Amino acid sequence: SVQTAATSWGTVPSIRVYTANNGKITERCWDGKGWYTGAFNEPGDNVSVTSWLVGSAIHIRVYASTGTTTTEWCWDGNGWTKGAYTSDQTAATSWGTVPSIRVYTANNGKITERCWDGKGWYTGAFNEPGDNVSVTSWLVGSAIHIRVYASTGTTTEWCWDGNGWTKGAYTSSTVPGDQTAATSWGTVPSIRVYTANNGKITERCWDGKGWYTGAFNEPGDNVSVTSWLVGSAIHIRVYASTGTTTTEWCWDGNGWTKGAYTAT
Secondary structure, X not given: OXXXXXEEEOOXXXXXXXXXXXXXXXXXXXXXXXXXXXXXXXXXXXXXXXXXXXXXXXXXXXXXXXXXXXXEEEEOOOOOEEOOOOOOOEEEEEXXXXXXXXXXXXXXXXXXXXXXXXXXXXXXXXXXXXXXXXXXXXXXXXXXXEEEEEEOOXXXXXXXXXXXXXXXXXXXXXXXXXXXXXXXXXXXXXXEEEEEOOOEEEEXXXXXXOXXXXXXXXXXXXXXXXXXXXXXXXXXXXXXXXOOEEEEEEEOOOOEEEOOOOOO
């Protein structure tokens, strides 16, 4: 299967899905006005994405990986520029507006972190075993809360609450080498952790009071996910991948419906 990562922003919204097929990562945009190919094209077998907003514009970071080489590609409004990231399988997330970017790298079963406080990159304290990694985070107004999902060749949530990593209460039924995705929203928060286990992606949910299996159930060997808020209404977009097929599935508070993105 192809490998996919996605990001969204704004209440329109605008969604960016980056699909790595045979060493060439390709973009597919959605400005609320149709799916159209984007100006992003770089070499890569793996890609993870994150984005924030500064002012009325967007800033996208896209982390392409080949072997053990991870080159960052920036969109500060002005073209796709090479980044200053040095360090395969990766997962990125941001917060604030400086911003602050963590990029967890599940190179060779040991997940390692690279942090950006705005003043250069520096290796972070995170060092946990696992083949696949996903990440999500959220702000409470002062404290950042990161949830890192490590899957040994069993998925183990790791929790940073502004003070030391601690093992999380995530429970799910996985298969060897399973592939995971995650998104979050709200202050509670609400977490949706999707895992790909031999062509059948499942959902595990946490509204703040006990994990529980979600309603989502579709076919796929890879999952990416993103969400956004229209009011207190959350809209999630999950991208399942099999071969080159990539079917978009949409939650809009009203059951799981198919999505406008082509299978491709």
